[PDB]
Amino acid sequence: VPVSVDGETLTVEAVRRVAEERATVDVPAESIAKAQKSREIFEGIAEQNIPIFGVTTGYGEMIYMQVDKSKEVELQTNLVRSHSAGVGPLFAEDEARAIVAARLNTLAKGHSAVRPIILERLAQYLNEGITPAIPEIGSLGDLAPLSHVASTLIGEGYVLRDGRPVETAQVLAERGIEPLELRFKEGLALINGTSGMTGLGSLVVGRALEQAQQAEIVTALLIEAVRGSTSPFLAEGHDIARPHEGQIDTAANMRALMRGSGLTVEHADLRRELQKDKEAGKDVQRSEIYLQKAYSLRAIPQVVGAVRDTLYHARHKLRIELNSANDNPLFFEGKEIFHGANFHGQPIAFAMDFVTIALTQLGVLAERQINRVLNRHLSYGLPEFLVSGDPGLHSGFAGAQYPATALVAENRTIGPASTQSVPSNGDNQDVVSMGLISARNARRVLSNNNKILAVEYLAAAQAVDISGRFDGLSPAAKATYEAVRRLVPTLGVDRYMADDIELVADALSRGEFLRAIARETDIQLR
Amino acid sequence: VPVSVDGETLTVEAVRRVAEERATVDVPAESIAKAQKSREIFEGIAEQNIPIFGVTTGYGEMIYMQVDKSKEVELQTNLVRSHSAGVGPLFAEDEARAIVAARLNTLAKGHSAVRPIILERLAQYLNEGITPAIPEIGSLGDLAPLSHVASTLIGEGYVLRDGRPVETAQVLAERGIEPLELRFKEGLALINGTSGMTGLGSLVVGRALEQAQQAEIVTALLIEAVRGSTSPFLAEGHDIARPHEGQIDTAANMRALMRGSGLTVEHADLRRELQKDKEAGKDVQRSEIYLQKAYSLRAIPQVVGAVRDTLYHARHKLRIELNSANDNPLFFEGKEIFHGANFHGQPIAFAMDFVTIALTQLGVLAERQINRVLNRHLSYGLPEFLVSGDPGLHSGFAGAQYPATALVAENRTIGPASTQSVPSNGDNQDVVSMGLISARNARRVLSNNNKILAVEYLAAAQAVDISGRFDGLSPAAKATYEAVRRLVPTLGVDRYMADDIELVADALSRGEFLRAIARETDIQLR
Ligand SMILES: N[C@@H](Cc1ccc(O)cc1)C(=O)O
């Protein structure tokens, strides 16, 4: 299962494989050769003492400082050090690995003028399990975080071991590795890109998509458990009447998940049951039958679909970015040293701010579906707060609804960061993107959404037990139901709810509910 | 010249033509035909008194109330009236027209089961200048605003005339038009869609792109005025190293705008001019010749490019939406009436929130470029605050910078609305999109951006006079320069600036600088 880091075809899912599943990485000889190439282009110029940014000059506003080739190695060392000023908590192992891979892929595109050893060493770290200790704060959108990574290649800084930072010097001398010594433009190239936000963003987006699927999965279970109509998901509504890709995809997944359900109702059945319930003698009469259900159980295609569209767009931008030469300056055949701003992370800063927004609404919808099932006037029949015990004496899921509701409110306090640029570096960086903050914002909402969904999964499984509708559940709903009971038992009388919720929340973050559908059925969700 | 409203091929630009230039609309015969057949079939179903949401039942939560068909017109009429509860300011003529246009296109798709007369009357209103008085507030994402529109079709509510509301019944008596009477499902179809946010959103996104163009136009002029480098715009840095579509477009537009400039330099002229400055003596030598770097002028493709991507995504969403049957329930030949939620404006709510964020950043960049030219420390040699006389005694543009700086901060206080749902209607509408609020937010930042750009167009022209570089400008830079000076004179002595700024802001809102590039050069911008 090797992953080709060529600076051209790396996908978001592949980055997750490398970061999450320790997937082996391989930098193609073509990438290596193309890499050495640009290296000679550069050196063929660096030979002379001619001016070039970040290699024969100062850094930032100090580009006005001309520097000779004498202390080539020191210039790189001074940069990586002075810029390793990151603060806050350290990124997690998988997060740090995703960042490292994005940077490797970037250098592997071939226009950074870096020695092949840089790519080879980076590739060794991932493959050898040596993860840099990357503090989360510092990037203006990603100098500081990438600087901490840079430090570990030169045997400095810290590496992540069992959740704690351990000096890189020891770890290397340990597994017998001579720390690299950075040459011209290697220090700058290592840190002058969007690898922080792009690496983290990839994990988040990939996971956001699974969350969309897992929202659809429990949403489907809930719809069955309450015998909702299937009309809202009919293809004519989306494939033909309002063709947004996301909407079509969710409507599709919903039909597959509820297919073969004995509990769901066809519109025609409602229309006919409702009709018989009417007295042809009077113009206006009351009925207890709802031809339609509330928005939270009817508008799933529109809302989750819009979220999907947002995630598709974000994945699209990341795929391009991962495979871009987000670095400066750059080198091309018979070309002058390209001086631009491909280090600017606006594209990804925007994409992630949009992910934050989309996932917030995904959570808003899940929480209202929980409110749906817990409220007796809205549940369509189930007992208040899903009590099995004498009600009042027992509260059921009443208290468990609070953290879900609370999280919706907390996610709404998270504002966009891609527009919060603040000028620094003597007005040199007068417009930045703060994209890493955007990525972290989306990560937070994603994380909070698993807790919201956790309560929804527990609630949906409980509604099944109380209604005694298990034998009517569809193949998918049975799988979902069983995956939940496997982790948490039915709620007879009241009990400490926290562990159960965190138990189902962690399962969701590991994609165990998407897994269950995969194993127990042949449905291949979009 | 007639825009074809067929519910299948309408474009955002087409919508703007109808709304802004009063282009004539035409519902093609095939559309009428489809509407005609779909109606007769629907009427047969209705005439049977079988349950059909909003046609033989109550609205929203009161769908449990069954209504006999003997109350056909009353049911629909009561809906339109009781839902005409909009508040706040009225939309402008062009905004009201875009909304009406989007509604007409929705119904014309042929799945709303409305009588052709409805499509005809709508078009007649557009083609004859009968503009509904539509209050901006009330939509949960667009019942209220659309009900006000619906009210005018039955000769109620108000029509917009000279910025003020005039009772509809009257205007129709003057124009000699007999009000319509609403039949089965016609009241619901007129209001149960996303036409509010989709009509406004179209105008905004259309203008947003023009705003990105004018941002690129003034940036090009400014870069020429200060003799900046053209290297960051080289095709290889985008087309090949970083292929985000928007970024490629901006770089290309910038190259075309500065083509033929005698004031711009290349990275080569700096490294070469730098070699001179440097000497074989010293090892760290300071120069005053910055390898060019202020991001404000180096990152243009990256930042404005990302803005473009956001705008492209939104335009696509709007194109799909304009041609959708965003209404409920829906009729499909030989099938059960579709009862879903295609009225839900989430896709557009998300789209416009993103546009809001994107445009906010566009303004952030412009404001910093203004700061760039007004700060002597960064002016590239220009006098402080572009004073052409005695600084201190005169402040020049020092005061004009404030409205621009203040607007950036003001735009930053505008939060996303697509996530602010609040359950209403007895919890039936437990999750909404708040999309029209999103569209308005976007329109606001758009409007605010014209003011910031206005200050930047003035400072740039001023920079050109003070440095006497008018002769070295490119053909586009001259067109831009003359366009500004045709409106506002050079700033000799300090003077009241408020009028000069508003005049240029207004010119920008009409696309004047984009037009100047059209009739003065052979440049076609993306
Ligand atoms: N990203 C900067 C390089 C840089 C280096 C050091 C800094 O402190 C800041 C910026 C550029 O390419 O212009």
Ligand SMILES: N[C@@H](Cc1ccc(O)cc1)C(=O)O
């Ligand atoms: N959008 C509603 C229609 C509606 C909603 C609320 C009302 O108050 C009236 C009508 C639906 O299609 O289900």
